Design a protein around this ligand. Structure first.
Ligand code: Y0X
Ligand code: NA
Ligand code: NA
Ligand code: NA
Lengths: 114, 114, 114
């Protein structure tokens, strides 16, 4: 799975340890081994949410399967939780787009997952 | 809705008010409430369009609904118009990918829109 | 087609000519003219792959058609090869998401490709 967070919070506000915490929490939530989890955090962005420049985040989570209505509600609770507690971003200023990828449409290590 | 622009135009060439202008104009073109519109501008990027490093932009508009053949033409006209006028990027060096998101696949406020 | 690579390798490690090499080789792999290929390299990113931050890349290739099981295997071998040779990124720390876009969902030059 791959999780990306783009945010206007400055880099100095992202705690040491945050990529590793995301990695573990995501391995647990998706049930995938942490070796297959990739995480990307992009701070200091020029962005607005509802017109406002208060702390916000635009995120995505791509996974081959493990995406669906109930799982996505559970991921959002987890990930909004983490963004609130670690980056002090309000959950109503977070979007997370979920993508259930076909294994044939994900390249890795010179091939695809199909 | 979430609109993202990545461009090789430098930050100093992004005029004050640009994020607000996008928010406002997208609210109107899409008909959706502006409190839900997020915008994100990423300047100074290392990019090429057609092999050329002349100003260009690669963009995404994601929304729950309001995505379709006629509507996307209207957004393309609007958004190429703003990138030409404000960032001096030629419309034929702009790509915009449109995504009609399922509500179950967008997290917000600890849950999803489902 | 549009190819984006996000990587933690520093900008000074991206060799001169790399965006042109990606442009040329993708034009060949996809069969589309290079005038229509866009590429975007994002170095110096805060990322982890499998819990750690050795060189890695998270990529996307969007194309109108020319996306499918065999083609994507070939694109993955081509793009992992380039990232390994040119950026010193191991193929097993690369993910590439492939997206077959509908023409009506790609804006360009004030309209869409529909
Ligand atoms: C805004 O639109 C929606 C909103 C909701 C909704 C509302 C409220 C929610 N949360 N409320 C609260 C309240 C208090 C909270 C408090 S508090 O202390 O009590 O204050 C503390 C905390 S805390 O942080 O725990 O402390 C909280 N979290 C709180 C909190 O979460 C919420 O949570 C997830 C979700 C759900 C669905 C919606 N829209 N759905 C669709 C679906 C399809 C559409 C299509 S189509 O069908 O797909 O085509 C086409 C088109 S169109 O083409 O554009 O016409 C459309 N418009 C579509 C469309 O709109
Ligand atoms: Na130049
Ligand atoms: Na896109
Ligand atoms: Na992607």
């Amino acid at each position: 799975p791959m999780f990306i967070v783009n945010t206007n919070v400055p880099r100095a506000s992202v705690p040491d340890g945050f990529l590793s915490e995301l990695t573990q929490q995501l391995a647990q939530a998706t049930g995938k081994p942490p070796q297959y989890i990739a995480v990307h955090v992009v701070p200091d962005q020029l962005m607005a949410f509802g017109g406002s420049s208060e702390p916000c985040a635009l995120c995505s989570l791509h996974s081959i399967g493990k995406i669906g209505g109930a799982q996505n509600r559970s991921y959002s609770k987890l990930l909004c939780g983490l963004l609130a507690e670690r980056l002090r971003i309000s959950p109503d200023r977070v979007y997370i787009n979920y993508y259930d990828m076909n294994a044939a449409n994900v390249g890795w290590n010179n091939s695809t997952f199909a």
